[PDB]
Design a protein around this ligand. Structure first.
Ligand SMILES: OC[C@H]1O[C@](O)(CO)[C@@H](O)[C@@H]1O
Ligand SMILES: OC[C@H]1O[C@](O)(CO)[C@@H](O)[C@@H]1O
Ligand SMILES: [K+]
Ligand SMILES: [K+]
Ligand SMILES: [K+]
Lengths: 301, 300
């Protein structure tokens, strides 16, 4: 009845959570088939996945653009070929798409800069470990953060490196920063996978108590951001919401020719020591309501 | 297949949430029938309800003993007769029962005490408005509180009254306290219904900015504790969880002759300005996962 293609820039616990949220919302609509592919952080594979979804003539395309520039031509094709395109989370560099949904990455950066400036009482040295440079969240996470800390002449960005969203490059790059900078008061990590990597670099150099750690994503579950705050590894992290259900509702509104917003902006919030506990109690319950919905879906058919 | 009778002491938004969770959890077991009654805060009516559940031969009894003494023989009776009894939230005076489930009312009390002492920097006058004196949560919430504030020589409890769990008495009692006490630094309310009562008495006397208000329950939804924090009426409230799902799973474990603990202590946490936002984000997401279950359950 309706087939949807999800072209996803990568695969990890954040994507996993969004995917499952989409599929879970699918079963509330009669007919709809959702197919999902990961690009494993590679622009070619993501083209291949988009071309694949175009060959299969899917009714709608959901994509998160790995890097902005290289993927622009490829999304434009799907658009001129008449297929409706939903951009999630990451953006492209033109307006040739049907609808955008995501959280404001610039404002998150701004929030990160303000939180650090407040915590360091207006004075200190920050190092930044970014996501993949050409992706729109890494760009904006940096811009917003620079905008915020410009208002504090004694908060200084003294080093920056591209960690490609991952813990591996984060560790090496943080090693280089520690070696070259005796005074570091804060690490700004673009996600909660970069963050533990930098921390482990600091831990191992006997210097993790000299600085605060800030990340983005704030997922519940083992190995994720919330847990890192509760474990006193991260001082703060910002909710980067997956909202898989609202993504599918958008798809359905478009397909079923219901009205829709062309742009849906989602909110963030800071998560830290003061609020990590109540958040965990609540997400723990969410997990339970989820497996209830999965048990209840299995009993149908 | 199995019949469970639930003898609730009260009816209100807190009880209703637990009642809904219990019913929703029962949909997941085959042939489990749950009948829920409210005593309307009356011991005789609650005695009747248990007696009724006994007469129709329920397989298990869930009870929140309105007051502890009046309800002990009745519970002791249903137990010796061989019906398993689950005590929820409130307790009776003796140990003769199958299992208890609730949160730690004493430690909630202690947390309130610590929170007020910290917020007032170890100096100030507190008024306390208790739940129904003869109920165990009210005894325990007061006693935990005394334990905490005993460690601060400059914190005084200057007045105390039995607000009987409700806004009405709370508002009259606060009113009196305000007239006799020119300096009040904090109000300790035993629940999120007593608190807005105390608050309105203060607001109407032009004094709400002089003190902090601390409550218990911290429920989501219009007119409850989370909203009161969000709206800056309540400075803090503590989570007193309902977890009707856990309550019914405990019933099923006993009836299915599966292993179960006699004592189940559930989690509390403080809710205030610093966490109310992520709190409400999560509950708002929880609330629609419920509508997503009413839909699915209502397609079977
Ligand atoms: O789009 C940026 C987002 O991508 C992720 O790496 C998920 O793959 C997140 O950690 C980050 O917030
Ligand atoms: O058992 C004490 C609890 O009972 C209630 O009054 C609801 O009936 C709550 O407000 C309070 O926390
Ligand atoms: K600066
Ligand atoms: K640290
Ligand atoms: K106040």
């Amino acid at each position: 009845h309706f087939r949807i293609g999800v072209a996803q820039c990568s695969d990890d616990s954040w994507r996993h959570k969004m995917n499952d949220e989409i599929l879970r919302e699918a079963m509330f609509y009669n007919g709809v088939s959702v197919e999902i592919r990961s690009a494993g952080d590679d622009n070619s594979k993501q083209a291949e996945d988009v071309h694949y979804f175009m060959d299969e003539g899917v009714d709608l395309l959901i994509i998160s653009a790995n890097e902005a520039a290289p993927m622009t031509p490829i999304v434009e094709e799907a658009y001129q070929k008449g297929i409706p395109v939903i951009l999630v989370d990451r953006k492209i560099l033109s307006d040739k798409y049907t609808a955008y949904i995501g959280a404001d990455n610039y404002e998150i950066g701004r929030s990160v800069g303000n939180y650090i400036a407040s915590s360091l009482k207006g004075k200190g040295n920050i190092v930044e470990l970014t996501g993949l440079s050409g992706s729109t969240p890494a760009m904006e996470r940096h811009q917003g953060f620079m905008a915020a800390i410009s208002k504090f002449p004694d908060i200084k960005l003294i080093d920056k490196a591209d960690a490609a969203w991952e813990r591996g490059p984060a560790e090496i790059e943080m090693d280089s920063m520690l070696r070259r900078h005796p005074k570091i008061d804060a690490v700004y990590a673009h996600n909660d996978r970069i963050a533990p990597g930098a921390y482990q670099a600091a831990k191992m150099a006997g210097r993790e108590k000299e600085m605060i750690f800030v990340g983005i994503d704030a997922l519940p579950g083992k190995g994720n951001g919330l847990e890192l705050v509760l474990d006193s590894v991260l001082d703060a992290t910002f909710i980067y919401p997956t909202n898989g259900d609202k993504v599918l509702q958008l798809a359905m509104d478009i397909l079923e020719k219901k009205p829709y917003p062309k742009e849906t902006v989602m909110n963030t919030a800071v998560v830290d020591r003061t609020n990590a506990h109540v958040m965990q109690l609540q997400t723990t319950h969410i997990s339970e309501l989820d497996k209830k919905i999965e048990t209840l879906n299995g009993r149908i058919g």
